[PDB]
Amino acid sequence: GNFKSKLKKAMLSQQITKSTIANKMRLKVLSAREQSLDGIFEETKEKLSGIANNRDEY
Amino acid sequence: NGIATLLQAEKEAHEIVSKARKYRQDKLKQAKTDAAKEIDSYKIQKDKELKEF
């Protein structure tokens, strides 16, 4: 029974090792979009400062 | 009676033999536990190899 439980524990710990690797890679993809998103707003902030510095269309 | 006292000693010797015979059964039971442990150890060793695999 201990060997069967250890095999089940090893089998269960096998799925978690694949699950944790899968979640980390899936969150890397999700964080890539947020990083690309933040690049847009960072570029937008620079462009917004340009509108303020015009002093004629501002 | 002196002869009857010797017979009582023989009964005591038989009781001692019976106690020794009972002790032998207890000793066999103690040896039985050791034999079971050896069988369990072999299964434990096989289980350990499976865990290593």
Side-chain angles (χ1 to χ4, degrees), chain A residues 1 10 16 22 27 29-33 37 39-41 44-45 48-50 52 58, chain B residues 2 4 9 13 20 31 35-36:
Chain A
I16 307 187
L27 286 184
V29 165
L30 293 179
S31 160
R33 293 166 190 166
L37 180 67
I40 302 307
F41 297 139
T44 303
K45 284 212 61 163
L48 265 188
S49 179
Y58 188 50

